[PDB]
């Protein structure tokens, strides 16, 4: 169900949302067990955090000491879980297009931290949740309308035997060459050259690289752009752009921080 | 006392005692008897020094935290020195 459609009935239910990750926080430490050491007698005890509250011992546990207010929290001997917060956007595909997409914060925990990155379209399955937020951190006073977030429990994005069987074929050069773009005219010297570009060479660290670089010349009135489009789909981690008016810095890296351009 | 020149003053103390143990049981006068007793009191005291108890006034109530630490050593001493 859509992000725009969540309502107060959902507030304790499990839900599942499709959306786009805009960005994430770094990992945030969440205390799961507090560690209290006695200033008088150096005895130590452990307290599990209950609903975000430290159940502090008011007097020292040891009956032979039993001093009040003598326990103190030894921060780096407490035990911590991992938490991360991610801004998940309603996709521009699903919006009523005259107005903005929404977004929702989600909390993701432990080894589910860093399961996704900016630009990932994902599903997230989790409990819908709501919490109050303080009017001033110096006070208990809370604002009437709660903050909402989804507290996730699962995420998802959006062998060699077969490979060996094909490897023995005699037509394999042409077989792989046709496969890159069977919808386009067969042009198989171009397709074979691109196939070698997809294979690549090897590397040596003592400089050189195992790259391959190709230029499709010829008229503007031919299918080479469509070949490029299919190769951009085929490759695992490529990019597509065009060179007219392409800045030396826009293509490469641009300015505070420096951000990578298309080629990088 | 324990550290300085591997505590050579300890041998000074026993030598001071030895210089009345040499003479006869009777020849140790009341002053010699007292001197040997004072040497023993020296060794006893050097054993006996120990960190003091942190002793607090109880008229005024405790704050929201107790005593911050019981450590009563001076800054140039570690407990292993003692």
């Amino acid at each position: 169900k859509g992000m725009r459609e969540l309502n107060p009935n959902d507030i304790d239910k499990l839900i599942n949302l499709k959306g786009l990750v805009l960005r994430s926080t770094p990992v945030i430490p969440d205390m799961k067990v507090a560690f209290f050491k006695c200033n008088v007698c150096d005895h130590t005890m452990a307290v599990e955090i209950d609903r975000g509250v430290i159940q502090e011992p008011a007097r020292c546990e040891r009956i032979d000491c039993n001093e009040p207010n003598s326990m103190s929290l030894i921060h780096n001997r407490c035990s911590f879980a991992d938490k991360q917060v991610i801004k998940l956007q309603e996709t521009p595909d699903f919006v009523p297009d005259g107005q903005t997409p929404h977004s929702i914060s989600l909390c993701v925990y432990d080894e589910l931290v860093d399961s996704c990155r900016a630009g990932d379209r994902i599903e997230v399955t989790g409990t819908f949740r709501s919490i109050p937020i303080r009017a001033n951190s110096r006070q208990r006073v809370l604002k009437s309308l709660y903050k909402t977030y989804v507290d996730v429990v699962h995420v998802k994005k959006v062998d060699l035997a077969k490979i060996r069987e094909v490897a023995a074929r005699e037509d394999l050069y042409s077989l792989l060459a046709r496969s890159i773009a069977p919808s386009i005219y067969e042009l198989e010297d171009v397709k074979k050259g691109i196939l070698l570009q997809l294979f690549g060479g090897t590397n040596k660290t003592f400089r050189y690289r195992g790259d391959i670089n190709i230029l499709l010349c010829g008229d503007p009135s031919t299918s080479k752009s469509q070949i490029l489009q299919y190769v951009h789909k085929i490759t695992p981690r490529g990019v597509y752009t065009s060179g007219k008016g392409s800045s030396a810095v826009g293509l490469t890296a641009y300015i505070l921080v420096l951000e990578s351009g298309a080629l990088v | 006392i324990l550290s300085m020149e591997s505590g050579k003053v300890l041998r000074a103390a026993i030598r001071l005692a030895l210089d009345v143990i040499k003479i006869d049981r009777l020849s140790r006068t009341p002053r010699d008897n007292m001197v040997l007793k004072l040497v023993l009191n020296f060794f006893r005291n050097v054993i006996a020094i120990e960190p003091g108890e942190f002793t607090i006034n109880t008229k005024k109530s405790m704050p929201k935290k107790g005593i911050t630490s019981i450590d009563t050593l001076p800054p140039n001493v570690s407990m292993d020195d003692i």
Partner: peptide, 12 residues
């Protein structure tokens, strides 16, 4: 005299 209480490291 000053009413007071003694806290001892040896019971640590």
């Amino acid at each position: 005299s000053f009413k007071s209480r003694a806290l001892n490291h040896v019971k640590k």
